[PDB]
Write a protein that binds this ligand. Structure first.
Ligand SMILES: *CC(=O)N1C[C@@H](C(N)=O)Oc2ccccc21
Lengths: 179, 235
């Protein structure tokens, strides 16, 4: 099993921590969702290849510009996370995270991940965003951002309902294996 | 880690650790407040266990088996003994605060009413200065440690077999030399997230909410000082 490194990046409340917990545990925690994710090594079999995928998070490092890059050494795939209920977090994808990731991790594939897709039909989400002259991030808006930033691909998931969670990590494993 | 502590923290939360009959006697807010405190101690136990792997298993293992040049092992495991003392003393205090909180006749039923004071002492004065200077040095030597490990693995045959040997157990899956180094660097950035979630469910006692607010500020000041004093090194 070849060893590959995955790192998730994104604004404070974009669901980057939930996404790792839900995948490593294989379920949305029924009793207590932990606050922090330490690390985890996933045994993934994608398209016939056996890979050992190390999982890392940058939660807590967002305000510390010298400390955060210490997470980047040897990354083989980057999950660029944004939240679908937060159009403002999508604005910081090409103006904040994309220049930094391309500086410390050049040529490393990036997958733009639209988190919290379940919130597209949540009534409270559409009401709160309307008192801002806004609405949930649309699938075509996500694709267009993934296009402009030269992301290897665009994917949507929901850590709450586990929908699309497996497909992101299987795809990230495929991306990491690429020449 | 010692079996006693491992069992006390083997559950996925405080609600699952204490006896269901004891849990059923508390307000839902207390269960949430204790769940996050249980995680602060659970992750502190794992942090100290990571440091023991680096000191006894890797660092000491190379000194007693390999013929490495003097100073290579220090470049590979910077400030590990200093970090180990800092956190083992924090873990000691956290664990005694839980043992004191246990009600008579049980070893698993507890409610930690005061925590803020312990966090204020750990993240202030000499203890805070000692972590600041320690983590500033650790993080500046972090890249150099990773490159040095990779050079030794890609050139030395004996070092290669030592690493394959010690990391073979199933328990060391996510705890190799490089994972241990990043695990320690990321650790300091966990505290504000944990203290903020504890603070959110600690409004019952006003002097506790203020203690946790002072502690939250103290940790953010520490992380800022460490971030300012970082100067990456290269071999
Ligand atoms: C101390 C203890 O384990 N207790 C004490 C008792 C109390 N609140 O006085 O509550 C329960 C319930 C079930 C099991 C043990 C205890």
């Amino acid at each position: 099993a070849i060893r590959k490194k995955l790192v998730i990046v994104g604004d404070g409340a974009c669901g980057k921590t939930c996404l790792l917990i839900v995948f490593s545990k294989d379920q949305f925690p029924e009793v207590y969702v932990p606050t922090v994710f330490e690390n985890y090594v996933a045994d993934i079999e994608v398209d016939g290849k056996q890979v050992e995928l190390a999982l890392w998070d940058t939660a807590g490092q967002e305000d510390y510009d010298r400390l955060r890059p210490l997470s980047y050494p040897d990354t083989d795939v980057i999950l660029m996370c944004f939240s679908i209920d937060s159009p403002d977090s999508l604005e910081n994808i090409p103006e904040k995270w994309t220049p930094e990731v391309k500086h410390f991790c050049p040529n490393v594939p990036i997958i733009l991940v639209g988190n919290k897709k379940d919130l597209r039909n949540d009534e409270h989400t559409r009401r709160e965003l309307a008192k801002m002259k806004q609405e949930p991030v649309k699938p075509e808006e996500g694709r267009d951002m993934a296009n402009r930033i030269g992301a290897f691909g665009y994917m949507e998931c929901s850590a709450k309902t586990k929908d699309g969670v497996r497909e992101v990590f299987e795809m990230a494993t495929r991306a990491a294996l690429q020449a | 880690s010692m079996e006693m502590d491992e069992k006390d923290f083997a559950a996925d939360s405080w609600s699952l650790a204490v006896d269901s009959s004891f849990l059923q006697q508390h307000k839902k807010e207390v269960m949430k407040q204790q769940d996050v405190i249980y995680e602060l101690i659970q992750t502190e136990l794992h942090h100290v266990r990571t440091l023991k792997i680096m000191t006894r298993l890797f660092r000491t293992g190379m000194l007693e088996e390999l013929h490495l040049e003097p100073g290579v092992v220090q470049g590979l495991f910077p400030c590990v003994d200093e970090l180990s003392d800092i956190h083992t003393r924090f873990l000691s205090q956290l664990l005694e605060r839980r043992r004191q909180a246990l009600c008579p006749g049980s070893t698993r039923n507890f409610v930690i009413h005061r925590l803020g004071d312990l966090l204020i002492s750990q993240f202030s004065g000499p203890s805070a200065e000692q972590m600041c200077k320690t983590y500033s040095e650790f993080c500046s030597r972090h890249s150099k440690a990773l490159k040095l490990y990779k050079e030794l693995y890609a050139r030395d045959k004996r070092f290669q077999q030592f690493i394959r040997k010690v990391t073979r157990p199933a328990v060391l899956k996510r705890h190799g030399v490089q994972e241990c180094i990043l695990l320690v660097t990321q650790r300091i950035t966990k505290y504000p997230l944990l203290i903020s979630r504890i603070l959110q469910h600690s409004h019952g006692i006003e002097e506790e909410r203020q203690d946790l607010t002072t502690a939250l500020g103290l940790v953010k000041e520490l992380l800022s000082n460490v971030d300012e004093g970082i100067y990456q090194l290269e071999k």
